[PDB]
Amino acid sequence: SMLLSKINSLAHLRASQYQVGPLLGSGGFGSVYSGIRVSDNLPVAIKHVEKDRISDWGELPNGTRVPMEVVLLKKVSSGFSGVIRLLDWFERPDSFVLILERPEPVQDLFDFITERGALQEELARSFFWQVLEAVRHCHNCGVLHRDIKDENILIDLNRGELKLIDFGSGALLKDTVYTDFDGTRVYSPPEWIRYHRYHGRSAAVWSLGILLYDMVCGDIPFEHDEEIIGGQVFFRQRVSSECQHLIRWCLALRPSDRPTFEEIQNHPWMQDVLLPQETAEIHLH
Protein backbone atom coordinates (compact mmCIF):
# COMPACT_ATOMS: atom_id res chain seq x y z
CA SER A 1 0.00 0.00 0.00
CA MET A 2 1.10 3.65 -0.47
CA LEU A 3 1.85 5.50 2.82
CA LEU A 4 -0.37 8.65 2.38
CA SER A 5 -0.73 11.80 4.61
CA LYS A 6 -3.94 10.53 6.30
CA ILE A 7 -5.72 7.19 6.75
CA ASN A 8 -8.63 8.70 4.73
CA SER A 9 -6.55 10.70 2.08
CA LEU A 10 -8.47 8.68 -0.65
CA ALA A 11 -11.98 9.23 0.99
CA HIS A 12 -13.13 11.85 -1.62
CA LEU A 13 -13.03 12.37 -5.48
CA ARG A 14 -10.46 15.15 -4.63
CA ALA A 15 -6.95 13.41 -4.34
CA SER A 16 10.19 10.44 0.11
CA GLN A 17 7.40 7.96 -0.95
CA TYR A 18 6.97 4.82 1.25
CA GLN A 19 5.25 1.48 0.48
CA VAL A 20 3.72 -0.26 3.57
CA GLY A 21 3.13 -3.98 4.04
CA PRO A 22 1.90 -6.11 6.96
CA LEU A 23 2.73 -5.87 10.67
CA LEU A 24 6.39 -6.97 11.20
CA GLY A 25 6.56 -10.63 12.34
CA SER A 26 5.62 -10.59 16.11
CA GLY A 27 3.87 -12.60 18.88
CA GLY A 28 3.14 -9.18 20.52
CA PHE A 29 0.89 -6.23 19.55
CA GLY A 30 3.29 -3.39 18.63
CA SER A 31 2.09 -1.07 15.79
CA VAL A 32 5.20 -1.51 13.59
CA TYR A 33 4.76 -2.37 9.89
CA SER A 34 7.13 -3.49 7.14
CA GLY A 35 7.95 -0.68 4.71
CA ILE A 36 10.16 0.35 1.76
CA ARG A 37 11.52 3.81 0.85
CA VAL A 38 10.51 3.88 -2.85
CA SER A 39 13.45 6.17 -4.00
CA ASP A 40 16.23 3.62 -3.13
CA ASN A 41 14.28 0.40 -2.05
CA LEU A 42 15.61 0.87 1.53
CA PRO A 43 13.84 -1.42 4.04
CA VAL A 44 12.15 0.57 6.87
CA ALA A 45 10.01 -0.06 9.94
CA ILE A 46 6.84 2.18 10.06
CA LYS A 47 5.73 2.74 13.69
CA HIS A 48 2.38 4.40 14.57
CA VAL A 49 1.91 6.23 17.90
CA GLU A 50 -1.66 7.04 19.00
CA LYS A 51 -1.96 10.69 20.32
CA ASP A 52 -4.59 9.73 23.01
CA ARG A 53 -2.03 7.18 24.45
CA ILE A 54 1.00 9.54 24.75
CA SER A 55 1.74 10.13 28.49
CA ASP A 56 5.09 12.05 27.80
CA TRP A 57 5.43 14.98 25.31
CA GLY A 58 8.41 17.28 24.53
CA GLU A 59 9.85 19.85 22.04
CA LEU A 60 12.36 19.54 19.13
CA PRO A 61 15.27 21.97 18.46
CA ASN A 62 12.37 23.60 16.42
CA GLY A 63 10.36 24.32 19.57
CA THR A 64 7.52 21.99 18.25
CA ARG A 65 5.32 19.56 20.30
CA VAL A 66 5.98 15.82 19.67
CA PRO A 67 5.96 12.60 21.66
CA MET A 68 9.04 12.47 23.98
CA GLU A 69 9.85 9.27 21.95
CA VAL A 70 10.53 11.52 18.84
CA VAL A 71 12.69 13.98 20.91
CA LEU A 72 14.81 11.07 22.25
CA LEU A 73 15.13 9.30 18.85
CA LYS A 74 16.29 12.53 17.20
CA LYS A 75 18.93 13.06 19.91
CA VAL A 76 20.48 9.51 19.49
CA SER A 77 20.00 9.26 15.65
CA SER A 78 23.10 11.52 15.18
CA GLY A 79 25.84 9.64 13.24
CA PHE A 80 26.19 5.83 13.45
CA SER A 81 25.69 3.54 16.48
CA GLY A 82 23.98 0.54 18.09
CA VAL A 83 20.67 2.49 18.01
CA ILE A 84 17.87 2.04 15.33
CA ARG A 85 17.84 5.51 13.74
CA LEU A 86 14.69 7.59 13.09
CA LEU A 87 14.88 8.33 9.29
CA ASP A 88 11.74 10.55 9.18
CA TRP A 89 8.41 11.21 10.97
CA PHE A 90 5.18 13.15 10.44
CA GLU A 91 2.05 14.15 12.30
CA ARG A 92 -1.51 13.02 11.46
CA PRO A 93 -4.72 14.32 13.14
CA ASP A 94 -4.77 11.53 15.80
CA SER A 95 -1.25 9.95 15.62
CA PHE A 96 2.45 10.28 14.74
CA VAL A 97 4.18 8.14 12.09
CA LEU A 98 7.85 7.20 12.68
CA ILE A 99 10.05 5.82 9.86
CA LEU A 100 12.87 3.76 11.43
CA GLU A 101 15.76 1.65 10.08
CA ARG A 102 15.05 -2.04 9.38
CA PRO A 103 18.08 -4.34 9.08
CA GLU A 104 17.49 -7.51 6.97
CA PRO A 105 17.80 -10.23 8.09
CA VAL A 106 17.03 -9.38 11.74
CA GLN A 107 15.95 -11.18 14.97
CA ASP A 108 15.38 -9.64 18.47
CA LEU A 109 17.57 -10.94 21.31
CA PHE A 110 14.55 -12.52 23.16
CA ASP A 111 13.66 -14.71 20.10
CA PHE A 112 17.39 -15.44 19.58
CA ILE A 113 17.67 -16.77 23.22
CA THR A 114 14.37 -18.79 22.87
CA GLU A 115 15.85 -20.48 19.79
CA ARG A 116 19.46 -20.99 20.98
CA GLY A 117 19.05 -21.09 24.80
CA ALA A 118 21.89 -19.86 27.11
CA LEU A 119 24.60 -18.12 24.99
CA GLN A 120 28.29 -19.14 25.08
CA GLU A 121 30.26 -16.56 27.17
CA GLU A 122 32.27 -15.35 24.07
CA LEU A 123 28.94 -14.49 22.30
CA ALA A 124 27.42 -12.94 25.45
CA ARG A 125 30.64 -10.83 25.87
CA SER A 126 30.44 -9.43 22.26
CA PHE A 127 26.65 -8.75 22.60
CA PHE A 128 26.87 -7.22 26.13
CA TRP A 129 29.88 -5.03 25.12
CA GLN A 130 27.88 -3.65 22.12
CA VAL A 131 24.82 -2.87 24.35
CA LEU A 132 27.16 -1.07 26.84
CA GLU A 133 28.57 1.08 23.97
CA ALA A 134 24.99 1.82 22.68
CA VAL A 135 23.79 2.86 26.17
CA ARG A 136 26.85 5.09 26.69
CA HIS A 137 25.99 6.73 23.30
CA CYS A 138 22.40 7.36 24.53
CA HIS A 139 23.66 8.97 27.80
CA ASN A 140 26.25 11.14 25.89
CA CYS A 141 23.24 12.35 23.79
CA GLY A 142 21.34 13.21 26.98
CA VAL A 143 18.87 10.26 26.66
CA LEU A 144 17.90 7.63 29.26
CA HIS A 145 16.27 4.54 27.61
CA ARG A 146 14.72 3.19 30.90
CA ASP A 147 13.68 -0.20 29.34
CA ILE A 148 16.95 -2.08 28.39
CA LYS A 149 15.97 -5.77 27.84
CA ASP A 150 16.39 -8.57 25.27
CA GLU A 151 12.99 -7.69 23.64
CA ASN A 152 14.33 -4.13 22.92
CA ILE A 153 17.54 -5.31 21.17
CA LEU A 154 17.61 -6.19 17.42
CA ILE A 155 20.45 -8.39 16.02
CA ASP A 156 21.62 -7.46 12.48
CA LEU A 157 22.45 -11.13 11.72
CA ASN A 158 24.79 -10.36 8.71
CA ARG A 159 26.95 -7.66 10.43
CA GLY A 160 26.86 -9.15 14.00
CA GLU A 161 25.68 -5.67 15.23
CA LEU A 162 23.13 -5.04 18.05
CA LYS A 163 20.62 -2.12 17.89
CA LEU A 164 18.46 -0.68 20.74
CA ILE A 165 14.80 0.03 19.90
CA ASP A 166 11.72 1.47 21.70
CA PHE A 167 12.37 4.78 23.45
CA GLY A 168 8.61 4.91 24.33
CA SER A 169 9.47 4.68 28.11
CA GLY A 170 12.63 6.84 28.07
CA ALA A 171 13.34 10.31 29.48
CA LEU A 172 15.84 13.12 29.08
CA LEU A 173 18.87 12.06 31.16
CA LYS A 174 19.22 13.96 34.47
CA ASP A 175 21.66 13.35 37.39
CA THR A 176 18.86 13.90 40.00
CA VAL A 177 16.30 11.39 41.29
CA TYR A 178 13.43 10.00 39.14
CA THR A 179 10.00 9.41 40.77
CA ASP A 180 8.23 7.89 37.67
CA PHE A 181 8.81 4.50 35.98
CA ASP A 182 6.74 2.66 33.24
CA GLY A 183 8.59 -0.79 33.13
CA THR A 184 7.24 -4.24 34.17
CA ARG A 185 7.62 -5.62 37.77
CA VAL A 186 10.29 -8.31 36.87
CA TYR A 187 12.56 -5.54 35.46
CA SER A 188 12.11 -3.03 38.39
CA PRO A 189 15.40 -2.17 40.25
CA PRO A 190 15.16 -2.76 44.04
CA GLU A 191 15.19 1.04 44.85
CA TRP A 192 11.99 1.43 42.68
CA ILE A 193 10.20 -1.49 44.44
CA ARG A 194 11.20 -0.26 47.97
CA TYR A 195 11.12 3.57 47.52
CA HIS A 196 9.69 4.57 44.06
CA ARG A 197 13.04 6.49 43.56
CA TYR A 198 16.08 5.79 41.33
CA HIS A 199 18.97 7.57 39.57
CA GLY A 200 19.17 6.96 35.80
CA ARG A 201 22.70 5.57 35.29
CA SER A 202 22.65 3.22 38.36
CA ALA A 203 19.14 1.86 37.39
CA ALA A 204 20.53 1.27 33.82
CA VAL A 205 23.44 -0.77 35.30
CA TRP A 206 20.80 -2.86 37.20
CA SER A 207 18.97 -3.54 33.90
CA LEU A 208 22.35 -4.51 32.35
CA GLY A 209 22.95 -7.07 35.15
CA ILE A 210 19.51 -8.59 34.41
CA LEU A 211 20.39 -8.70 30.67
CA LEU A 212 23.85 -10.30 31.18
CA TYR A 213 22.25 -13.03 33.45
CA ASP A 214 19.52 -13.48 30.75
CA MET A 215 22.17 -14.03 28.06
CA VAL A 216 24.38 -16.54 29.98
CA CYS A 217 21.46 -18.37 31.78
CA GLY A 218 18.70 -18.20 29.07
CA ASP A 219 16.21 -16.36 31.27
CA ILE A 220 16.01 -13.41 33.71
CA PRO A 221 17.03 -14.08 37.33
CA PHE A 222 13.91 -12.79 39.21
CA GLU A 223 10.11 -13.30 38.87
CA HIS A 224 8.89 -11.81 42.24
CA ASP A 225 9.47 -8.51 44.15
CA GLU A 226 10.94 -10.46 47.14
CA GLU A 227 13.61 -11.90 44.78
CA ILE A 228 14.44 -8.40 43.40
CA ILE A 229 14.96 -6.93 46.92
CA GLY A 230 16.34 -10.11 48.54
CA GLY A 231 19.92 -9.72 47.27
CA GLN A 232 20.49 -13.43 46.31
CA VAL A 233 21.46 -14.47 42.73
CA PHE A 234 21.08 -18.22 41.92
CA PHE A 235 22.80 -19.59 38.76
CA ARG A 236 20.78 -22.48 37.14
CA GLN A 237 23.41 -22.85 34.29
CA ARG A 238 27.21 -23.14 34.31
CA VAL A 239 28.67 -19.57 34.36
CA SER A 240 32.38 -18.63 34.94
CA SER A 241 33.23 -17.15 38.37
CA GLU A 242 34.33 -13.86 36.69
CA CYS A 243 30.98 -13.57 34.77
CA GLN A 244 29.04 -14.37 38.03
CA HIS A 245 31.15 -11.65 39.80
CA LEU A 246 30.25 -8.96 37.20
CA ILE A 247 26.49 -9.93 37.30
CA ARG A 248 26.35 -9.84 41.13
CA TRP A 249 28.15 -6.42 41.06
CA CYS A 250 25.64 -4.92 38.51
CA LEU A 251 22.81 -6.37 40.72
CA ALA A 252 24.09 -4.81 43.99
CA LEU A 253 20.98 -3.87 46.09
CA ARG A 254 22.33 -0.40 46.94
CA PRO A 255 22.67 1.84 43.84
CA SER A 256 26.00 3.33 45.12
CA ASP A 257 27.52 -0.25 45.24
CA ARG A 258 26.92 -0.79 41.45
CA PRO A 259 29.87 -0.40 39.07
CA THR A 260 30.28 2.62 36.78
CA PHE A 261 30.41 1.97 32.99
CA GLU A 262 34.23 2.33 33.28
CA GLU A 263 34.36 -0.36 36.03
CA ILE A 264 32.09 -2.73 33.98
CA GLN A 265 34.21 -2.41 30.79
CA ASN A 266 37.51 -2.76 32.77
CA HIS A 267 36.18 -5.97 34.47
CA PRO A 268 38.26 -9.15 33.85
CA TRP A 269 35.24 -10.92 32.22
CA MET A 270 35.03 -8.09 29.58
CA GLN A 271 38.66 -8.53 28.16
CA ASP A 272 39.32 -9.64 24.51
CA VAL A 273 35.90 -8.79 23.01
CA LEU A 274 35.29 -10.04 19.42
CA LEU A 275 34.54 -7.52 16.60
CA PRO A 276 30.93 -7.54 15.33
CA GLN A 277 31.93 -9.19 11.96
CA GLU A 278 34.03 -11.86 13.86
CA THR A 279 30.90 -12.42 16.03
CA ALA A 280 28.67 -12.95 12.93
CA GLU A 281 31.27 -15.32 11.26
CA ILE A 282 31.74 -17.52 14.37
CA HIS A 283 28.22 -17.33 15.96
CA LEU A 284 25.52 -16.14 13.51
CA HIS A 285 26.48 -17.50 9.95
DSSP string computed for 213-263: HHHHHSS-S-SSHHHHHH-----SS---HHHHHHHHHHT-SSGGGSPPHHH
Residue 158 burial (C-beta neighbours within 10 Å; 0-12, 13-18, 19+): middle
- Whether residues 223 and 266 share a domain: the answer is yes
List the resolution, Å: 2.0
- Whether residues 91 and 56 share a domain: the answer is yes
Residue 32 annotated as part of some ligand binding site: yes
Asked whether the CA dihedral 232, 238, 239, 245 is positive or negative, the reply is positive
Strand partners, 161: 156
Radius of gyration over every alpha carbon of the chain, rounded to an integer in angstroms? 20
What residues contact residue 19 under an 8 Å CB cut-off, 6+ apart? 1, 2, 3, 35, 36, 38
The one catalytic residue among 88, 94, 147, 225: 147
- Whether residues 98 and 230 share a domain: the answer is no
- Whether residues 37 and 120 share a domain: the answer is no
- Whether residues 61 and 117 share a domain: the answer is no
Residue 200 annotated as part of some ligand binding site: no
Q: How many CB atoms lie within 10 A of CB 181?
A: 17
* Among candidate residues 63, 88, 104, the one where a domain is terminated: 104
Taking the C-alpha atoms of residue 256 and residue 64, their distance in angstroms, rounded to an integer, is 38
- Whether residues 196 and 97 share a domain: the answer is no
Strand partners, 101: 44
After which residue numbers is the chain interrupted with C–N beyond 2.5 angstroms? 15
Taking the C-alpha atoms of residue 231 and residue 73, their distance in angstroms, rounded to an integer, is 35
- Whether residues 205 and 218 share a domain: the answer is yes
- Whether residues 39 and 138 share a domain: the answer is no
Taking the C-alpha atoms of residue 20 and residue 205, their distance in angstroms, rounded to an integer, is 37
Taking the C-alpha atoms of residue 235 and residue 164, their distance in angstroms, rounded to an integer, is 26
21: left (phi over 0), alpha (psi -120 to 50) or beta: beta
- Whether residues 20 and 93 share a domain: the answer is yes
Taking the C-alpha atoms of residue 22 and residue 5, their distance in angstroms, rounded to an integer, is 18
Verify whether residue 166 is a known catalytic residue.
no
SS3 136: helix
* Among candidate residues 52, 75, 104, the one where a domain is terminated: 104
Residue 101 annotated as part of some ligand binding site: yes
- Whether residues 168 and 125 share a domain: the answer is yes
- Whether residues 86 and 127 share a domain: the answer is no
Residue 79 annotated as part of some ligand binding site: no
Residue 25 annotated as part of some ligand binding site: yes
The torsion of the CA quartet 102, 50, 111, 88, rounded to 10 degrees, works out to 10
Look up residue 69 and give its amino acid.
E
- Whether residues 126 and 48 share a domain: the answer is no
Q: Which domain holds residue 96?
A: 1-104
Work out how many domains the chain is built from and give that number: 2
* Among candidate residues 104, 134, 157, the one where a domain is terminated: 104
Q: Residue 97 carries which DSSP code?
A: E
